[PDB]
Each structure stands twice: as C-alpha cells, then as structure tokens.
Design a protein around this nucleic acid. Structure first.
Ligand code: NA
Ligand code: NA
Length: 326
DNA sequence: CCGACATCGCATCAGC
DNA sequence: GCTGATGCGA
DNA sequence: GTCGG
C-alpha cells in the first residue's frame, strides 16, 4: 500500500480522530476512526466507493458516507468547518504539548490562551510536566534515527551495569523489533533481588547515575517503579547539538520481567494475535503473567517464566523481535 | 438496542 | 492531613 | 463510530 493510494482518506480519518479525542472528548470515537484509518492504510487498492470500504473491519455506515463525500468532492464539509473554527482548532493544537490533554487544552482556550506564545506568557498556569512539554515542543515531535537509539542504548546499558552489574536492562518498543527510527526510548529494568513476592531505590539509583553523567536532563514523573523523562546525547565537538528525547524506564519484578519485555516489544497487532492464540490453547497472557484456565474459565497461579521463549513454549515457536510486526 | 471498546503509574485536584 | 478521583501518557 | 450479544 503506497501513501497516496488512499492517503486522502486516512488523513481525513486521522484528522477526524484527533478532534473526537481532543475537542469532543470521545475516546471511543477517536479509537474507531484510528482503527478505520489503519485497516484502510493496509488495503492494497485505490478505494472507489464507501460501499467498497464498508467491507473492511471497522469501517461502518458513517465512514462509508464520509468516503463517498470525500471521493466526489475532494473534501469533507464538517472537517472544513471544524478546521476553520478558532476555538476547536486551537484546543486540538494545544494538546500537541506533552502534559496538555483535552481537558487542560479546553481550559486554556476558555481563558484566551491559544498558542505556544500564549503558553509562553503564562508559565504560572502550567504544571511541571507541561512546562517541559512546552520547553521541548519541537524536539518531542522529531523521530529518532536508529543510529542515535543505538548510541542512547550504549549509554543506558553501560551506566546501568556500572550501578550494579546484576541489573538486567532491555530497550524494547519498535527499536527492539529493528525499526529504522523511534518516537522515544522505553527501557525495561529488573534485578535478582526484586520479585512480586518481595530495596525500593533500585530505580532511583539508575535514574541518578544517568543524571550524573548528564544523559537524563529533566524529569516528567518518577516513583518506585516508573520513571518518565527527557534525555540527550552528548554534543560531539563544535558539531550541532542533538535534540532532547523522551525516555521512560520501568522497574519490573524479575518473575514478570519477560512477560513485560514481550509486551513492551509488541507490535500491538502481534500482541492481540499472540494473546488470542494463547486463549485458544488455554492460557491467559497479560503484561505481567501467563496463567492457565481453568475448565470454565478460572485462571490459576502465574506460571514460572525465565525468558521470552518460555512464554512461546507454554502455548507452542520463538519468534525473534525482527518478525513481530504481525 | 445498547454496552464494550487497554490499563495502570504518577501527579495533582477535589472532598472531607 | 489523608483518601479517592481525574487527567495524562503510553 | 463500529461491532456484536
Ligand atoms: Na465494515
Ligand atoms: Na498533549
């Protein structure tokens, strides 16, 4: 499926999704539009009618009508109208700021605050998260080349091992699956001394070392198990400075680590398929555990898991991250 | 016809 | 001051 | 908005 095959339709649908989420506050309509957009992005034919589209799983009566209008007129009256609406287009736009969701964007626009400039003049009304989102607005919308992720990973695995050589850290997300760029870095962390059935500074000490070497530059949120923040690679000589990047780090108990790694590696499609297959073969897989059902349909104890492969074993053949797109 | 549609950790607000 | 709700991101 | 019990 090439971009311009049905790119007009998927852009329209993604645009409609964003308004549902950010303006109408209708999360289930946002997911419906996104799902319609995904199944269409995949369909290897230029769509000629709404009826043709309606066949796809997640395209219903109203999206088929919208496609027809778009097809015959090259636009959509309702999207054209909302696009030109000052209140709505500003609410939608403010939410591109990390930490500003539908509800904060609504309040800001209510009181006349509509642009990054306006937010700039109003630091007093921004929480800590929002100030950082505003501060790195542009950097946060940049993709991360794989080569930079590898440099980031070097730093993270080096500094973790240097804190305590018994830690295990895995960079997951699409980077682990071999993607060519990434949106952020997601690091999963464990230690032999941390299990479900069981100190509480294991995460702090890693975040602390990454700040000591000045890799982590800012903190969005941090508790005993999850850290969310901002990092940057060292600038190499008088060459231009790297953009600031999003990095999350989570500490997972050892006996849940590999269910964690499998999940946060994905992709999403893969996960759903794999959790289907596992139901079908009699076990339940969430992010934490795998458990047997149950003559109808009672889940018993979490089964021991010691690698990713162990999970495949329980349900029957290890697929490497590379081939986990679907 | 009408309810489901990811799920949870952390930060902060609302209520007492 | 504490407890539960909500907003947010992923 | 779409699906399905
Ligand atoms: Na359909
Ligand atoms: Na936002």
């Amino acid at each position: 499926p090439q971009e311009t095959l049905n790119g007009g339709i998927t852009d329209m649908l993604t645009e409609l999704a964003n308004f549902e989420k950010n303006v109408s506050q209708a999360i289930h309509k946002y997911n419906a539009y996104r799902k319609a957009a995904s199944v269409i992005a995949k369909y290897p034919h230029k769509i000629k009618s709404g009826a043709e589209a309606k066949k796809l799983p997640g395209v219903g009566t109203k999206i088929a009508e919208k496609i027809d209008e778009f097809l015959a007129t090259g636009k959509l009256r309702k999207l054209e109208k909302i696009r030109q609406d000052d209140t709505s287009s500003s609410i939608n736009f403010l939410t591109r700021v990390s930490g500003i969701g539908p509800s904060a964007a609504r309040k800001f626009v209510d009181e006349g605050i509509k642009t990054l400039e306006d937010l700039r003049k109003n630091e007093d009304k921004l929480n800590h998260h929002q100030r950082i989102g505003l501060k790195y607005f542009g950097d946060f919308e940049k993709r991360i080349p794989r080569e930079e992720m590898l440099q980031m990973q070097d730093i993270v695995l080096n500094e973790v091992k240097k804190v305590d050589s018994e830690y295990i850290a895995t960079v997951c997300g699409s980077f682990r699956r071999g993607a060519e760029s990434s949106g952020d870095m997601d690091v999963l962390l464990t230690h032999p001394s941390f299990t479900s059935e069981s100190q509480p500074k294991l995460l702090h000490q890693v975040v602390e070392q990454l700040q000591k070497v000045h890799f982590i530059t800012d903190t969005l949120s941090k508790g005993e198990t999850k850290f969310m923040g901002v990092c940057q690679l060292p600038s190499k000589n008088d060459e231009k400075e790297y953009p600031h990047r999003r990095i999350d780090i989570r500490l997972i108990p050892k006996d849940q680590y590999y269910c964690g790694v499998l999940y946060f590696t994905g992709s999403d499609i893969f996960n759903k398929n794999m959790r289907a297959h596992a139901l079908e073969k009699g076990f339940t897989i969430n992010e934490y555990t795998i458990r047997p059902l149950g003559v109808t349909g009672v889940a018993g104890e979490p089964l021991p898991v010691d690698s990713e492969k162990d999970i495949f074993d329980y349900i029957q053949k290890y697929r490497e991250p590379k081939d986990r797109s679907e």
